[PDB]
């Protein structure tokens, strides 16, 4: 009966759908799934879902993967009010939008640079990538630049998304100095419900990284 | 005052949103904009948004991009009942979460073959890459052997946009011999208003790739 999310701190979306748990204040059930241990992972989870999906939100038996529709399904069954997912089309478009930016174009080129690095052997940035995800990043220094947040003057679940990918990069390691919206959203994010949560998950990602890259 | 969609017929998510705007039946006028030839580009584009983003929507000056932000905010504020994008929370959570595949995995994958190979010298398709596209079709031929289509046993936006993706692939050429649920959802999808308009489409882009594989 207890709503559960199936949770790797070290993973941007996982940590995406838990502040988006924490910006709408659901009381939640988390269970810990160590990916780097898959001999250890546990019962209760390879039951459930096709394959090794985190986040996985059980709510009630609704089992349900993907960060961001994980994010959006909870602001709209549990949210208090309108704030964090703005029930205006257009207003709700924008945030869509922005979610679809995290997910096709941000944590997309934020993973082009960390897999490879973690897992497949790779010791260095290659500077296509790193060209890449600035393109990227350039853009969202301009979503900043006519707004506080990401997709409105107020805190959306596009601020909880994008700022678990953002602080991913930046413990790796990223120079943001020619982005200065970036720089002063990121404060910003701080203040989010979560946020140190977010910061220790997403530290061990940036540990787990550099450890790996030859300098 | 009229619904307009700024679209170039060779991009899968183009396509994807075109598809949307033919489900849901809502006239739209569309304006072709060719991204093969940038010093071509018209001014009426140009103005509008931040950078060359395609598609791009223009409902009544309320400006959109990313195709699947385009598809739902099109079902919900034109759709002339449910079927397409269900309002029903956990039926909606579904579709969005295969929106969110579509994004995050499909066309990701797709273009990490493809964008090198338009554009960047590369001649043939990574075997490494093909793995990881292959991984994540299989993914989606699971999705398929569930329901009909995939998001529900009735067909959704969730279709029409992995629909754009997969004729993408196929158009290039690829062997899905090993996913028979992808290869039954592929020929209703031919079903789907404006399926020959993307068709043609996804075949201008298949043959912009194979032109640059040395066989």
């Given at each position: 009966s207890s709503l559960k999310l199936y949770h790797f701190p070290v993973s941007?979306?996982?940590?995406?759908?838990?502040?988006?748990?924490?910006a709408i204040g659901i009381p939640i059930q988390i269970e810990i799934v160590n990916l780097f241990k898959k001999e250890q992972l546990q019962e209760s989870?390879?039951?459930?879902?096709?394959?090794?999906?985190?986040?996985?939100?059980?709510?009630?038996?609704?089992?349900?993967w993907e960060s961001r529709a994980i994010?959006?399904?909870?602001?709209?069954?549990?949210?208090?009010?309108?704030?964090?997912?703005?029930?205006?089309?257009?207003?709700?478009?924008?945030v869509?939008?922005?979610?679809?930016?995290?997910?096709?174009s941000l944590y997309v080129k934020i993973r082009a640079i960390c897999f490879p690095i973690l897992f497949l052997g790779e010791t260095e940035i290659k500077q296509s990538l790193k060209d890449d995800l600035n393109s990227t990043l350039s853009f969202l220094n301009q979503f900043l630049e006519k707004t506080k947040w990401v997709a409105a003057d107020h805190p959306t679940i596009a601020d909880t998304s994008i700022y678990a990918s953002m602080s991913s990069i930046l413990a790796?390691?990223?120079?943001?100095?020619?982005?200065?919206?970036?720089?002063?959203?990121?404060?910003?994010?701080?203040?989010?419900?979560?946020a140190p949560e977010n910061e220790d998950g997403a530290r061990t990602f940036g540990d787990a990284v550099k450890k790996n890259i030859k300098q």
């Open positions: 941007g979306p996982s940590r995406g759908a838990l502040l988006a748990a924490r989870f390879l039951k459930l879902n096709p394959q090794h999906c985190v986040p996985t939100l059980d709510d009630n038996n609704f089992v349900l994010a959006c399904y909870l602001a709209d069954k549990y949210g208090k009010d309108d704030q964090w997912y703005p029930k205006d089309l257009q207003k709700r478009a924008v869509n939008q922005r979610l679809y930016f995290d997910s096709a790796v390691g990223w120079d943001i100095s020619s982005f200065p919206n970036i720089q002063r959203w990121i404060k910003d994010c701080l203040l989010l419900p979560g």
